[PDB]
Design an enzyme around this catalytic site. Structure first.
Site, PDB file in Angstrom:
ATOM      1  CG  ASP A 166      14.575  31.028 -23.204  1.00 14.68           C
ATOM      2  OD1 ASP A 166      15.577  30.752 -23.727  1.00 14.68           O
ATOM      3  OD2 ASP A 166      13.645  32.123 -23.925  1.00 14.68           O
ATOM      4  CB  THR A 167      16.462  34.317 -18.726  1.00  9.13           C
ATOM      5  OG1 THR A 167      16.187  33.807 -17.036  1.00  9.13           O
ATOM      6  CG2 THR A 167      14.484  34.838 -18.753  1.00  9.13           C
TER       7      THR A 167
ATOM      8  CB  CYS B 182      15.247  39.496 -11.856  1.00  9.22           C
ATOM      9  SG  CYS B 182      15.186  38.017 -12.535  1.00  9.22           S
ATOM     10  CG  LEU B 183      10.024  37.460  -7.970  1.00  7.83           C
ATOM     11  CD1 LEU B 183       8.418  36.622  -8.093  1.00  7.83           C
ATOM     12  CD2 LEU B 183      10.245  38.318  -6.532  1.00  7.83           C
ATOM     13  N   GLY B 184      14.123  35.925  -9.359  1.00  7.42           N
ATOM     14  CA  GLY B 184      14.603  35.016 -10.342  1.00  7.42           C
ATOM     15  C   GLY B 184      16.637  35.568 -10.260  1.00  7.42           C
TER      16      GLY B 184
ATOM     17  NE  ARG C 193      15.425  31.590 -28.689  1.00  8.78           N
ATOM     18  CZ  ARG C 193      15.107  31.597 -27.176  1.00  8.78           C
ATOM     19  NH1 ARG C 193      14.649  32.935 -26.196  1.00  8.78           N
ATOM     20  NH2 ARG C 193      14.924  30.377 -26.548  1.00  8.78           N
TER      21      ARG C 193
END
Ligand code: HEC
Length: 405
Positions: A242-243, A348-350, A177
């Protein structure tokens, strides 16, 4: 600061959508993008905003281009240009079959096994946290909770110190951002000059945290070098700072104007799974891209070598042909169609951790603070980027209506 129209783009496939500031931001941030899926919008446009680039606006083409890495490569997956040629993280800026060595390794440090292990550490922050909270009648939801709980979890996993969060956060936000205080390239080196010392320590004194195992793993069949481990780490530092933290503001957001999703949850503890799934479609939030490898004709539209294409992961689940009533939240949606987590090699790994963390969150939050509202008179702001954001989310409750566990 519209770039002029490349000679090969038809005037009529031009749509000037600004992904860092889109026109309808005040409608909310999934509301502003959805304007791409309006009936006056070709499946596949170009904006001349942030350097000129393609945007697929529909689940099937996002999925499809997500599928086709030989044509659509994540070499530069960031808008703008400077950021993507700058972006080098690993596995995220690779293509199959490079990627596959490094991804497995980013999967050791965060994939399922790690989440099970961390289970009670995740359970006890989420309930510590709300408990410290629930007696006040009040929190800025962003900074009181959305930030401290995943992030502290990730510092716990990365064995990074907590004093370091405010710098790691500010720098990671400058890649998704950007305030324009600083280029991506800028954000990113500064992140690396934090990393590069710890990596070096950890290859010497090898540990059990994400950074040492990443530091000390092997790939391909030889030692990972210091330089790749550094780009291995700066994905992580992003999904971890941050996601998740944003998607949380997203949904408490939500839990706050809608009595009955709150009410349906407290007496459907096993709808929580489905619920979390539906909040993923509905607050999907990531958007990144691909660069074309070659001239290539996609769905009747001439893409050329090197051109960038935004494939908003966020869109797919918002498109009225993958889901009836895109904007309306429903908990028993019979198929939650999405790509919130991505589509393709790069899934996404996360995810398992995000989820985890969404689940416990809602189970603990509704459990001790069932009834809570938007602090009043406030209008809620979102920011728009590669990771869309909530600026501030003042929350209010009667403490008489809370439960100590
Ligand atoms: C602990 C790590 C972690 C967490 C928490 C996390 N992610 Fe990820 N994410 C990753 C990593 C690592 C990759 C790269 C994996 C690969 O290359 O195959 C990634 C990849 C992605 C992608 C791929 C997009 C592209 O370039 O294709 C998307 C989308 C994504 N994440 C969404 C999310 C969302 C949504 C959340 C929030 C709810 C989230 N991630 C939380 C670590 C995280």
């Amino acid at each position: 600061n519209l770039a002029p129209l490349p000679p090969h783009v038809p005037e009529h496939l031009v749509f000037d959508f600004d992904m860092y500031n889109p026109s309808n931001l005040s409608a909310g941030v999934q509301e502003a993008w959805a304007v791409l899926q309006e009936s006056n919008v070709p499946d596949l446009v170009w904006t001349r905003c942030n350097g000129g680039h393609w945007i697929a606006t529909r689940g099937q083409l996002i999925r499809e281009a997500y599928e086709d890495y030989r044509h659509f490569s994540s070499e530069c997956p960031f808008i703008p240009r400077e950021a993507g040629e700058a972006y080098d993280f690993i596995p995220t800026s690779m293509d199959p079959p490079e990627q596959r060595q490094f991804r497995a390794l980013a999967n050791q440090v965060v994939g399922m096994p790690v989440v099970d292990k961390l289970e009670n550490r995740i359970q006890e922050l989420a309930c510590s946290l709300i408990e410290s909270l629930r007696p006040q009648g009040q929190c800025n939801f962003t900074e009181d909770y959305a930030e401290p709980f995943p992030i502290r979890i990730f510092m716990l996993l990365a064995g990074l110190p907590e004093e370091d969060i405010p710098h790691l956060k500010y720098l990671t936000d400058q890649m998704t951002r950007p305030d324009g205080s600083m280029t991506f390239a800028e954000a990113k080196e500064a992140l690396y000059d934090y990393l590069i010392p710890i990596i070096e320590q950890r290859r010497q004194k090898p540990g059990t945290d994400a950074i040492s195992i990443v530091a000390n793993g092997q790939v391909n069949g030889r030692p990972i070098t210091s330089d790749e481990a550094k780009r291995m780490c700066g994905a992580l530092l992003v999904g971890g700072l941050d996601t998740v933290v944003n998607f949380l503001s997203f949904s408490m957001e939500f839990l706050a104007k809608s009595p009955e999703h709150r009410q349906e949850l407290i007496e459907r503890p096993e709808r929580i799974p489905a619920a979390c799934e539906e909040l993923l479609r509905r607050f999907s939030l990531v958007a990144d891209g691909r660069i074309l490898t070659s001239d290539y004709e996609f769905h009747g539209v001439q893409l050329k070598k090197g051109d960038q294409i935004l494939l908003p992961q966020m869109l797919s689940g918002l498109d009225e042909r993958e889901n009836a009533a895109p904007m309306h939240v429903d908990f028993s949606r019979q198929k939650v169609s999405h790509t919130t987590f991505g589509h393709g090699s790069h899934l996404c790994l996360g995810q398992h951790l995000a989820r985890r963390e969404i689940i416990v969150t809602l189970k603990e939050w509704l459990t001790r603070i069932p009834d809570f509202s938007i602090a009043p008179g406030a209008q809620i702001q979102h920011k728009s980027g590669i990771v869309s954001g909530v600026q501030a989310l003042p929350l209010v409750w009667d403490p008489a209506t809370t439960k100590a566990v």
